[PDB]
């Protein structure tokens, strides 16, 4: 991934489900705001513990 | 929203185990579906005018899964869940060598310890391969785009 | 931060717990956080000093 | 298929543990009325209404799993 | 009690809905060999059979 740099804080989220590993962030749309928008979906085969 | 697919070498023999009410070794130690999602199951055969697909060594499955704890003797049965994997696959090879093959592997004490143990059986082929596909649908996981 | 994900726990070459087996995920920010590269591969520990 | 090039000789550099320096309490709770890092609905966006939803969330005003990075030994350059 | 018959003539005692206690038995047993299977030696006199 290409992520730019700034000075505002960052919120990141990681989870998994049987369809894939879902990675959420704010920067991608809410650079000035903050939210969980799914910027990545890993096509995973097995769950992670 | 999406489709999820699994393909495998499923012969005509344990097709009777394909029932959702069936709870054989296929449906207990090898493969269990999600009843909450509508699905379809298809058994197919290689056409003789088709060399694009290949064949494995032979069919196989696990007829018994069990886990040893750190005391070597408290046995925890392992069952396949809805689109989940018991660790029996991690110790059973892609092709089981023979019927009744016993595989054992060490487990760390902080994970319960002991030895994961599995017993596997094999099924021979006919002149042509019979395989199986499972198709399962997804309504609102992501963009509705298939 | 750089993360690693798997499903197995084991002791190291010196007995410290934390060995992961089989295919596992590692993600890493690099280049002052510009790149966020992730990869689900087989790790091999080195055996030197 | 992948490349992901490769590495250097089988000789690793040293690592030390000194974690007493890393042991310090910086109190930072998490407010839910300020919505500090909570999952959004994946495809169901609304407007100007309050809505209940069952998902994965943490508690309120929690402590965390506090870690921190630092710089190594140096002298001069 | 009595002169015990031999290994091919093992004598059976069955027990159901009563109080077995290996604490009064193994303390009075000069245990010189102890092999077992499928019920842990801490659980030979802990669980309810
Ligand atoms: C470290 O210090 C820097 C200061 O440089 C902080 O950066 C500031 O952060 C605040 C908080 O978000 C910003 O304030 C916001 O300004 C918006 C206007 O921005 C305009 O100008 C910028 C710069 O030119 C443009 O890039 C941008 O597109 C806009 O044109 C307001 O609109 C914001 O209000 C809206 O958002 C908030 C939050 O969602 C809502 O609550 C409001 O109701 C409203 O909808 C907001 O006021 C400020 O602009 C930032 N400055 C700069 C230069 O970037 C860092 O945040 C700080 N970091 C830390 C960790 O403290
Ligand atoms: C830093 O990251 C970059 C980007 O991933 C690496 O550079 C380039 O990486 C790609 C993929 O690993 C390499 O391309 C591949 O080459 C093969 C031919 O062997 C081709 O068949 C593939 O389709 C793919 O294009 C590319 O060679 C590589 N460029 C280089 C090495 O100059 C870079 O290697 C990374 N730096 C590291 C690992 O130190
Ligand atoms: C969003 O919701 C607010 C909250 O109800 C709305 O504000 C109300 O607007 C009505 C209409 O003028 C007033 O009678 C209320 O007193 C307002 N309440 C508050 C708390 O402000 C607002 O109009 C809504 N906006 C949209 C676009 O739906
Ligand atoms: C996982 O790694 C272990 C190493 O102990 C190995 O025995 C096992 O076969 C591996 N399984 C898979 C599926 O790679």
Kindly report the three-state secondary structure assignment for every residue of E21-39. CHHHHHCCCCCCCCCCCCC
Cβ contact B1:B115 at 8 Å: no
Short-list B135, A22, A27, CA closest to D43: A22
Helix/strand/coil for B28: helix
Tokens 């055969």 correspond to B45
Short-list B41, B56, B60, CA closest to B129: B56
Instruction: Give the gap in angstroms from C-alpha A48 to the nearest C-alpha of chain B.
Output: 11
Task: Resolution in Å, one decimal, please.
Answer: 6.6
Cβ contact A10:A25 at 8 Å: yes
Which tokens belong to D14?
């040293």
Q: Whose CA is nearest to atom 20 of ligand 1?
A: A32
- CA D36 from centre of chain: 13
Q: Whose CA is nearest to atom 5 of ligand 2?
A: D4
Short-list B121, B133, B116, CA closest to B4: B133
> Is the Cβ of E42 closer than 8 Å to some Cβ of chain B?
yes
Chains A and E touch (3+ CB pairs under 8 A): no
Q: Which residues contact B115 (CB under 8 A, 6 or more apart)?
A: B68, B72, B104, B105, B106, B107
Q: Which ligand is nearest to the CA of D47?
A: 3
Give burial (CB, 10 Å; 0-12/13-18/19+) of B51: exposed
Nearest CA in chain B to C22: B90
Which tokens belong to B145?
């785009």
Measured between its terminal Cα atoms, the distance across chain C in Å is 26
Nearest CA in chain A to C1: A12
Ligand 1 within 6 A of CB of A8: yes
Q: Which residues contact A26 (CB under 8 A, 6 or more apart)?
A: A10, A11, A33, A34, A35, A36, A37
Chains E and D touch (3+ CB pairs under 8 A): no
Q: Whose CA is nearest to atom 48 of ligand 1?
A: A32
Cβ contact B82:B39 at 8 Å: no
Ligand 4 within 6 A of CB of C10: no
Experimental method: cryo-EM
d(CA B69, CA B107): 8
Instruction: Give the gap in angstroms from C-alpha A44 to the nearest C-alpha of chain C.
Output: 9
The percent helix, strand, coil of chain E (3-state, each to 5) is 15, 0, 85
């Amino acid at each position: 991934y290409n992520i730019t740099e700034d000075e505002i804080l960052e919120w990141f989220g990681i989870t998994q489900t049987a369809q894939g590993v879902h990675l959420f962030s704010s920067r991608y749309v809410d650079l000035y705001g903050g939210n969980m928008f799914q910027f990545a979906t890993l096509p995973v085969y097995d769950t992670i513990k | 929203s999406s489709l999820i697919l699994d393909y495998f070498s499923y012969p005509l023999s344990m097709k009777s185990d394909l029932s959702v009410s069936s709870a054989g070794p296929i449906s207990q130690f090898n493969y269990k579906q999600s009843f909450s999602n509508p699905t379809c199951l298809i058994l197919a055969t290689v056409p003789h005018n088709l060399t694009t697909i290949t064949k494995p060594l032979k069919y196989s499955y696990i007829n018994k899964c069990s886990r040893l704890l750190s005391d070597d003797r408290t046995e925890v049965p392992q069952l396949v869940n809805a689109n989940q994997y018991s660790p029996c696959v991690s110790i059973v090879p892609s092709t089981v060598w023979e019927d009744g093959d016993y595989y054992r592997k060490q487990l760390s004490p902080l994970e319960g310890g002991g030895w994961l143990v599995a017993s596997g059986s094999t099924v021979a082929m006919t002149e042509q391969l019979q395989m199986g596909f499972g198709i399962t649908v997804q309504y609102g996981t992501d963009t509705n785009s298939v | 931060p750089a993360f690693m994900l798997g499903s197995s726990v084991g002791n190291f070459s010196d007995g410290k717990m934390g060995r992961f087996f089989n295919h596992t995920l590692v993600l890493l920010p690099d280049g002052c956080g510009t790149l966020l590269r992730a990869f689900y591969c087989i790790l091999e520990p080195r055996s030197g000093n | 298929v992948d490349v992901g090039p490769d590495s250097v000789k089988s000789a690793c550099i040293e690592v030390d543990i000194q974690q007493t320096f890393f042991d310090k309490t910086w109190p930072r709770p998490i407010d839910v009325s300020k919505a500090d890092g909570i999952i959004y609905p994946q495809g169901r966006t609304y407007s100007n209404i309050t809505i209940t939803y069952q998902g994965l969330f943490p508690y309120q005003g929690d402590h965390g799993d506090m870690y921190v990075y630092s710089a190594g030994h140096a002298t001069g350059t | 009690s009595g002169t015990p018959p031999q290994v091919y003539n093992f004598k059976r005692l069955v027990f159901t809905n009563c109080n077995y206690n290996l604490t009064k038995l193994l303390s009075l047993f000069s245990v010189n060999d102890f092999t077992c299977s499928q019920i842990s030696p801490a659980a030979i006199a802990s669980n309810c059979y």
